[PDB]
Design a protein around this ligand. Sequence first.
Ligand SMILES: COc1cn(-c2cccc(C(F)(F)F)c2)nc(-c2ccnn2-c2ccccc2)c1=O
Ligand SMILES: [Mg+2]
Ligand SMILES: [Zn+2]
Length: 315
Amino acid sequence: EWQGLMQFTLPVRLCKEIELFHFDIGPFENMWPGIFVYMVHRSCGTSCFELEKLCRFIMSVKKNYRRVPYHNWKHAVTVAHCMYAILQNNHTLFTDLERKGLLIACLCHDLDHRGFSNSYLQKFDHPLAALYSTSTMEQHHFSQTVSILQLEGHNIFSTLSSSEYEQVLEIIRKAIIATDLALYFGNRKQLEEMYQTGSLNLNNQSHRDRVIGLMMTACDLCSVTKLWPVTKLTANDIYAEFWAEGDEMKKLGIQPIPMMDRDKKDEVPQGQLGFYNAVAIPCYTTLTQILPPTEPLLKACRDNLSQWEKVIRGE
Ligand SMILES: COc1cn(-c2cccc(C(F)(F)F)c2)nc(-c2ccnn2-c2ccccc2)c1=O
Ligand SMILES: [Mg+2]
Ligand SMILES: [Zn+2]
């Protein structure tokens, strides 16, 4: 599988399509690993990584995504693409280290997800919960990523010094961690303060780290920024998963929260409207103020919000 991927070229008609934020990968399934390769070449160059090791990696990574309805291989590619799109529109912002790691981080950010939130894991005493007390799944995702690097001929970062090596793993570590929604609220709130007092400074490493955190979350949630038909269907995949976690609580005899209860299909529209207002819109709003080129995300997020309102009011 890994040998045939090196001989892949992206069809010319997509070269320009990919660059857009609202580009949907849904119909290009057997090309997804190629599209990732493509994204790394444009974003770094062919000289950056060793092609042989890079292909083994993407296939291993692919292998360890599970057949869950939403936290799967399609979602990893979708998220990676959004990060690509961000980086290409902010070419001057990031160091060579950041560009590389961040794409890797996005690809691996939900490795070996089982379909369960941190709550369900910390509630019913899962082994992972015993190991990882905070950011449970997120620390595991990083475990998985490190273990895949350490396989034979999978270490894509071979050609870097000790110093450069542990820098990029720290970037990847904190990035993947920042994908937990619990930390987004703090992070985002700290960044609004620093922008409106004008104390934000990207020379400051801890300020850079906060921004990258927000970029992760913006990328993670980017399915709310696609065109309406795609966003609509991606929602069905999210709730299928929410509802399966809820049916694991019903099996014991417990009513889950309304979000995870399939008896309340009828409230999904309102659930979305709530989620856009409290989470999605402030995310892209704050991202845009720090990185104006990412305005198209905010625009798209707004358009879908309207659409859910029309649904709510019966149109
Ligand atoms: C009500 O609809 C939705 C609720 N959540 C959500 C998720 C967790 C916690 C909470 C908390 F805020 F309730 F804590 C809300 N996430 C999404 C969503 C849209 C895109 N990715 N994504 C997502 C993000 C993370 C996990 C699953 C899905 C969503 O559409
Ligand atoms: Mg995750
Ligand atoms: Zn994710």
